[PDB]
Amino acid sequence: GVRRTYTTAAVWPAEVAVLADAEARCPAAVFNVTLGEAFLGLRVALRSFLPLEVIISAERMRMIAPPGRFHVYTLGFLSDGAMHQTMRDVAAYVHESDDYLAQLSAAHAAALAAVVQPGPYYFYRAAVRLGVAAFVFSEAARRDRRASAPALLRVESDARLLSRLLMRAAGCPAGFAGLFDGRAERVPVAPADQLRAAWTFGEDPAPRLDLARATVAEAYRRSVRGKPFDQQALFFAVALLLRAGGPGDARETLLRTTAMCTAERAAAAAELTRAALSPTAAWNEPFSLLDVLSPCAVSLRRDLATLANLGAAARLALAPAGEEEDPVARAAPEIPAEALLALPLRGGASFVFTRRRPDCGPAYTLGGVDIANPLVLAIVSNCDYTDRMPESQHLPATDNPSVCVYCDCVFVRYSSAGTILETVLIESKDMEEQLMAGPSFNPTLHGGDVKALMLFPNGTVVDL
Amino acid sequence: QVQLQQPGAELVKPGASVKMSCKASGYSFTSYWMNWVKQRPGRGLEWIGRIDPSDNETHYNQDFKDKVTLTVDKSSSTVYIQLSSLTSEDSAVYYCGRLGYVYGFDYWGQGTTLTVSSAKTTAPSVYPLAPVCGTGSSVTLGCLVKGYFPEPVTLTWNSGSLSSGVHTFPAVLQSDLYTLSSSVTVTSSTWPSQSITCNVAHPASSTKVDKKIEPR
Amino acid sequence: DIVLTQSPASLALSLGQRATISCRASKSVSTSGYSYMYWYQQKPGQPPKLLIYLASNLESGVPARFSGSGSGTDFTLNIHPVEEEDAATYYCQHSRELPWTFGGGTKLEINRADAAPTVSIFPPSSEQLTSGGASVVCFLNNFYPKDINVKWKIDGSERQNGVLNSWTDQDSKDSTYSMSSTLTLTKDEYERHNSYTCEATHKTSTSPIVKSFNRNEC
Ligand SMILES: *[C@@H]1O[C@H](CO)[C@@H](O[C@@H]2O[C@H](CO)[C@@H](O)[C@H](O)[C@H]2NC(C)=O)[C@H](O)[C@H]1NC(C)=O
Ligand SMILES: *[C@@H]1O[C@H](CO)[C@@H](O[C@@H]2O[C@H](CO)[C@@H](O)[C@H](O)[C@H]2NC(C)=O)[C@H](O)[C@H]1NC(C)=O
Ligand SMILES: *[C@@H]1O[C@H](CO)[C@@H](O[C@@H]2O[C@H](CO)[C@@H](O)[C@H](O)[C@H]2NC(C)=O)[C@H](O)[C@H]1NC(C)=O
């Protein structure tokens, strides 16, 4: 028998009125979305796996017979097991909701499963979910084009964001450059979407810098007072500041995102991930993968888990969709891989918490911590042999002479279990005032299992 | 889209209290302060105070401390302002305005017109104004909105689709009732061949009336 | 309390020219590198719209002809080139300390070419006559300058009583003014006369613009 390749062509039997298309492609993976009037044509393939090609149409093609709203067609070498499955699953996705925002929630949760546990099933499912979300939007938008014009930015930016994260989990450098091409950049931008738009189109950061700085500053002031902040607007502000912040902006930003990523906030991000990845997850409450990534995966708290992939995904997500590729690593290159938590200093230095003490460096071993889960605090400045422990001291003055002594200091709480609970930057005299009083974090409320440190732009003291 | 929804009108007697509402959507309700702003007819803007919907923290303008109480309902995404011992000095448009993180007011409600008065609500009479019998390249049609109380009314032409060539005249108060009018100018080929309808909403009486302009 | 003083109270400019609006604060509104200064535009029947935040930053979707500058106590809003839709009132505002306050407002008006009013007269609607009332409506539309006089005549006699006038703010597209004049009579008074006239006198013509109808002969 002569060795030959067997190639089949399948032609969709109606012409498609094409509205949008996008493709991301490298040797490892391919992902294409084609949108037409009442048409989705989607092709996804991972190297060494069978391609998946799916069509969703509002119309049913004439079938030869013996004498929901949409129709799903699957092209490929699926045996009955995967063929019956794929057809039923893809139809269940498209008919789940006529609301494009609920479809987008499901697309975010499916992309989250793919970043956390990369593999062919989660990659193909998340590619399908993104395509169906864009299709349901396109179908609603088709009807009233003037009313839909403000909602285009959210879908377009998420298509760029989700495709980038999915293509990297598949081993490719880039997601879609654009889906709804030329359309989104022409639409007026609402104030609530300014930071998202600056990220989506890679706009000159200069007119949005004060806005980004104020977003970060205010998010932090709220966090420390126990108030919720806009974590999505925070994500886009951080993205702008790490790409084109003035001197010391990137450093000030990462101190604040670290401070906002409390141990409690980190556990909330892990609980939210679990709830989003649940097979019984419902989209009555909207979900964005930015709700898990911001503040924690854009912070210098590295430790929490079965979701270390989140940090790397968020650092990738931070690059605009219009030197080190990682803007977090770019802002503070001195921070090592073994750092549980870092607090950036002036002069290319940072405080660094680790389990094991550094070699040839000044370090403090922290008192009152379990021997199996220890805490070493070191300063990483670009050889010391001495065994250091932090000096026990009380807080003087307590006088308010319009001079801030504890300004630029970090108040740190740690447990006997060896977890850094809180990391409070004292940025104002107002905060310094609350530190002496009896906000919430620095006044006493918790028992004799929690210790506290004052970290200076020099050395370390144990309070009280 | 960020939306702040305020009822158009409140009619309240002198000496009574009022509660005005601002329903927020399209953003995380507990992540932003809500301001209230007072504007009296043909006068400037006065900032009343702000409330944080997350924990009910308030800041008040000291001029309003005895007059005003801000509250929130998280479950309905609603901010309220309550005013006590109402006088005619309190009659004004009351705006809610979201505080941006830059500390300016980035989104605004349409405003509630508060009328402090012992007079009753009166729905308007809406009259179509068609041209005289006997004709150039363009046609002016009108809509007369007579004898309503309190302010405001909202007038549209063809449910808002006919917006150019429109003049809507401010209301005039005559013997305790308001009268407003509107004109619309179209080409002679457009009317009466295509339908022109005046729509008038009076929020205080919850009335919405349509009058088609028919030739005399 | 911080008092904000705007100057001028009113500005009239031709299309294409530079509008400069000043805001002076009684105390500094600048702290730690930021000025807590904001500018808003307001058109009648609409809420104010934020133009400029933190003294110098253009809000999203605001045209580049708008700019703000200043620090401490002295602040400026610039509009260059001015366009028709810029006819509005402009307010400065501070968020430096309690109470937050606004400036007194600056009304910007556009200077343009003279334009004769278009005059239209409307007899009472048949619906109104059924109710016992009779309003006669006269529109004087799209004129410039705003100075105008209107006269009603009933069977060639001037009528002053029962006349109510209303004026639009300057038009956002063509910078003209409009006026409604409404003569309110009883159905009985209305039916006692034949000839109804609205006369507009405006500087664009030596002769008034006269619109009339006869109650009888349609
Ligand atoms: C995504 O896939 C579609 C469908 O295969 C591509 O559009 C086709 O491109 C071929 C050339 O490869 C044309 O000759 C066909 O006319 C196209 N069909 C339709 C329905 O548009 C599209 O090029 C892909 N997008 C990207 C960005 O590569
Ligand atoms: C830098 O290091 C010194 C180490 O002693 C810090 O301690 C202060 O030292 C001065 C010395 O006269 C005392 O008056 C203060 O009371 C000390 N403060 C505390 C809290 O112990 C000093 O704070 C560090 N400086 C900065 C700017 O970080
Ligand atoms: C913040 O304000 C609200 C309302 O003023 C408080 O919650 C309750 O309000 C509901 C309806 O608005 C009533 O049914 C309850 O009786 C209130 N319950 C209690 C226990 O007060 C709310 O508690 C306030 N929360 C904080 C943290 O200040």
Side-chain angles (χ1 to χ4, degrees), chain A residues 1-440 442-464, chain B, chain C:
Chain A
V2 168
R3 297 270 157 180
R4 293 190 202 172
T5 61
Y6 190 92
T7 58
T8 292
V11 182
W12 180 247
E15 282 205 320
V16 178
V18 184
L19 297 174
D21 62 277
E23 193 174 287
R25 182 170 223 139
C26 88
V30 64
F31 177 28
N32 176 309
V33 172
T34 304
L35 299 170
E37 293 178 8
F39 179 93
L40 168 70
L42 193 151
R43 201 193 182 275
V44 66
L46 205 60
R47 190 180 42 212
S48 79
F49 294 93
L50 300 174
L52 174 65
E53 191 138 12
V54 165
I55 290 167
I56 310 168
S57 188
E59 67 204 329
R60 200 179 81 188
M61 290 301 161
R62 274 152 153 176
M63 283 160 299
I64 300 160
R69 321 222 87 163
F70 296 108
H71 301 94
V72 177
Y73 306 84
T74 303
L75 309 142
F77 297 106
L78 291 76
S79 265
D80 55 85
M83 187 64 84
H84 293 12
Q85 182 203 278
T86 313
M87 234 127 157
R88 287 180 207 124
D89 291 24
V90 174
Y93 300 160
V94 75
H95 297 116
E96 188 185 86
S97 181
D98 287 334
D99 180 19
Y100 85 89
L101 291 162
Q103 287 292 354
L104 206 45
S105 289
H108 274 92
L112 179 60
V115 312
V116 167
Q117 278 213 317
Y121 177 80
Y122 288 147
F123 174 65
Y124 279 42
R125 184 184 71 176
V128 167
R129 282 295 212 162
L130 180 56
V132 350
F135 177 62
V136 176
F137 170 71
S138 180
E139 284 300 289
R142 259 175 82 219
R143 271 83 208 170
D144 205 351
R145 268 160 182 173
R146 285 205 169 268
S148 305
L152 174 54
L153 178 59
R154 186 167 294 261
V155 181
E156 181 59 34
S157 55
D158 289 344
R160 289 176 198 207
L161 167 69
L162 299 178
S163 71
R164 182 191 296 173
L165 302 190
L166 283 172
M167 296 302 292
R168 275 277 182 108
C172 285
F176 307 145
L179 173 60
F180 305 102
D181 294 295
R183 289 171 178 167
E185 213 171 341
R186 290 189 229 109
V187 188
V189 176
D193 293 328
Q194 287 189 83
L195 294 170
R196 178 181 287 271
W199 180 88
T200 305
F201 309 117
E203 303 179 347
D204 173 27
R208 321 266 101 107
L209 263 183
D210 281 359
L211 174 65
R213 273 193 289 264
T215 302
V216 176
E218 180 69 357
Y220 174 67
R221 289 192 290 250
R222 290 183 70 74
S223 186
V224 83
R225 284 157 186 91
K227 302 167 184 275
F229 53 82
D230 192 330
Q231 75 280 338
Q232 289 182 34
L234 182 71
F235 175 87
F236 293 118
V238 173
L240 202 78
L241 291 159
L242 301 188
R243 85 171 160 110
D249 275 340
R251 176 196 67 87
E252 283 293 285
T253 299
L254 295 166
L255 270 177
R256 288 179 221 276
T257 65
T258 311
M260 290 167 90
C261 192
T262 284
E264 182 192 300
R265 186 70 189 233
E271 190 43 53
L272 187 51
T273 298
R274 235 180 167 188
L277 304 189
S278 176
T280 61
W283 312 110
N284 299 70
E285 294 154 322
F287 177 75
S288 174
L289 123 166
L290 301 182
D291 309 333
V292 307
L293 264 21
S294 178
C296 287
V298 298
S299 87
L300 302 165
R301 185 190 285 273
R302 244 191 187 102
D303 221 45
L304 162 63
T306 193
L307 36 128
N309 291 333
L310 293 186
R315 288 166 186 228
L316 163 73
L318 286 169
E323 66 163 55
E324 183 71 269
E325 281 168 41
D326 184 341
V328 177
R330 193 165 73 235
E334 71 279 5
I335 296 159
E338 76 162 78
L340 301 159
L341 195 139
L343 296 156
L345 295 165
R346 295 192 264 256
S350 62
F351 280 109
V352 157
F353 290 95
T354 52
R355 298 288 174 205
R356 289 202 163 273
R357 51 160 177 85
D359 285 8
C360 261
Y364 295 93
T365 180
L366 258 50
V369 171
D370 291 333
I371 285 89
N373 211 50
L375 287 169
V376 178
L377 198 175
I379 312 150
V380 186
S381 62
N382 311 288
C383 176
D384 181 272
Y385 280 84
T386 195
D387 215 335
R388 296 266 142 168
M389 255 212 204
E391 260 183 56
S392 291
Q393 280 170 64
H394 284 281
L395 39 100
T398 346
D399 63 335
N400 61 94
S402 72
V403 178
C404 201
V405 285
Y406 290 95
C407 276
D408 298 290
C409 288
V410 182
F411 177 81
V412 178
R413 284 156 146 264
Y414 66 96
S415 64
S416 45
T419 48
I420 308 108
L421 300 167
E422 282 187 290
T423 250
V424 182
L425 169 73
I426 300 131
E427 53 137 27
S428 65
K429 289 181 270 179
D430 316 280
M431 284 204 198
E432 194 188 47
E433 280 187 302
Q434 299 304 302
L435 180 86
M436 269 73 187
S440 57
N442 33 60
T444 190
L445 208 83
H446 309 283
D449 63 288
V450 177
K451 272 189 157 284
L453 304 157
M454 199 58 77
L455 312 198
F456 288 80
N458 68 14
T460 310
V461 301
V462 52
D463 299 293
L464 296 102
Chain B
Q1 196 184 303
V2 174
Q3 279 179 255
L4 306 181
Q5 279 162 245
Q6 298 184 262
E10 293 302 326
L11 173 66
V12 184
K13 292 181 189 299
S17 302
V18 75
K19 193 174 187 195
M20 293 172 285
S21 63
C22 176
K23 191 179 205 289
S25 60
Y27 73 94
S28 194
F29 179 60
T30 57
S31 293
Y32 296 83
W33 295 80
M34 192 64 67
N35 302 273
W36 289 88
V37 171
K38 177 186 186 186
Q39 192 171 40
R40 285 185 277 200
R43 288 159 91 174
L45 300 158
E46 318 159 64
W47 175 83
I48 298 164
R50 60 175 171 134
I51 185 159
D52 192 328
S54 74
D55 59 4
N56 306 330
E57 189 184 4
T58 58
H59 299 290
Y60 292 101
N61 180 338
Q62 284 303 286
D63 296 353
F64 294 93
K65 70 152 188 167
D66 303 320
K67 176 60 68 174
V68 166
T69 305
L70 306 178
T71 57
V72 304
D73 187 344
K74 278 162 89 167
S75 87
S76 62
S77 290
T78 303
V79 180
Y80 300 98
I81 187 170
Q82 189 233 294
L83 279 76
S84 64
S85 332
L86 290 158
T87 68
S88 56
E89 278 289 282
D90 295 313
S91 300
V93 178
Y94 290 83
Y95 295 106
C96 64
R98 190 186 83 160
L99 194 67
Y101 281 22
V102 299
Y103 272 69
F105 322 144
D106 59 357
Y107 287 91
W108 292 76
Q110 290 297 310
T112 298
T113 308
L114 173 65
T115 302
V116 180
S117 174
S118 56
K120 73 167 188 82
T121 303
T122 313
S125 292
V126 180
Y127 306 124
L129 313 177
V132 185
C133 327
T135 43
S137 60
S138 72
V139 187
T140 301
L141 310 173
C143 194
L144 179 58
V145 181
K146 183 164 184 69
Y148 69 95
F149 193 83
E151 302 212 74
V153 297
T154 301
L155 191 152
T156 59
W157 292 96
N158 280 346
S159 298
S161 69
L162 177 53
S163 62
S164 63
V166 173
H167 303 292
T168 302
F169 303 89
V172 172
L173 180 72
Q174 172 66 224
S175 300
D176 301 61
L177 299 170
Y178 291 96
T179 300
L180 175 143
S181 59
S182 182
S183 73
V184 59
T185 303
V186 300
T187 47
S188 272
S189 65
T190 307
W191 191 87
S193 73
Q194 282 158 261
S195 177
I196 293 162
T197 302
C198 176
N199 332 286
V200 176
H202 186 235
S205 60
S206 313
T207 54
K208 281 173 265 180
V209 49
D210 289 6
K211 287 288 188 299
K212 195 187 188 289
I213 324 295
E214 290 277 18
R216 290 183 193 258
Chain C
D1 295 10
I2 302 171
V3 176
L4 302 181
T5 306
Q6 278 178 243
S7 39
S10 76
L11 190 49
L13 275 185
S14 305
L15 298 185
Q17 295 180 333
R18 183 174 292 275
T20 299
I21 303 174
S22 302
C23 186
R24 187 171 267 168
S26 63
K27 308 158 207 172
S28 169
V29 297
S30 306
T31 192
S32 303
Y34 289 133
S35 302
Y36 290 94
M37 182 49 53
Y38 312 86
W39 293 91
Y40 303 81
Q41 180 190 66
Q42 189 185 35
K43 298 192 189 193
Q46 286 177 20
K49 168 190 178 154
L50 178 69
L51 303 171
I52 310 285
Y53 60 86
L54 297 167
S56 63
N57 301 286
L58 200 59
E59 183 57 301
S60 186
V62 178
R65 69 182 178 270
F66 291 88
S67 58
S69 54
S71 63
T73 68
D74 303 299
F75 297 89
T76 306
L77 175 76
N78 282 281
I79 319 168
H80 190 249
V82 156
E83 290 189 10
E84 298 94 320
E85 66 169 347
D86 298 338
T89 304
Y90 295 89
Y91 295 91
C92 60
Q93 182 261 132
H94 85 83
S95 301
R96 175 61 187 90
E97 52 181 55
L98 282 188
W100 294 351
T101 67
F102 288 91
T106 300
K107 191 172 185 179
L108 180 56
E109 283 190 295
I110 284 99
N111 291 328
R112 55 146 288 154
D114 292 359
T118 305
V119 186
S120 303
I121 203 170
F122 302 85
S125 67
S126 57
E127 295 110 302
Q128 186 188 25
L129 288 164
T130 305
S131 74
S135 301
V136 196
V137 176
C138 183
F139 300 126
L140 292 70
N141 291 335
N142 300 90
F143 58 91
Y144 189 90
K146 64 171 91 194
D147 319 79
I148 199 156
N149 292 306
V150 67
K151 198 172 277 191
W152 284 91
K153 287 169 185 176
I154 299 171
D155 288 333
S157 302
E158 192 167 331
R159 179 69 179 249
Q160 280 144 55
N161 299 333
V163 178
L164 298 157
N165 296 328
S166 186
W167 303 266
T168 60
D169 294 83
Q170 190 166 37
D171 191 79
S172 72
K173 280 175 210 296
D174 69 7
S175 315
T176 68
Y177 297 89
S178 298
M179 187 184 180
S180 198
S181 186
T182 307
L183 173 60
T184 306
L185 303 162
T186 63
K187 188 196 187 178
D188 286 335
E189 285 186 273
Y190 178 69
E191 285 170 6
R192 281 182 227 121
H193 303 285
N194 174 57
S195 193
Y196 291 81
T197 298
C198 174
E199 308 195 358
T201 177
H202 188 77
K203 71 168 295 172
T204 51
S205 193
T206 270
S207 62
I209 305 158
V210 180
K211 291 296 189 286
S212 305
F213 70 86
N214 298 317
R215 186 185 52 87
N216 292 277
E217 52 257 60
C218 227

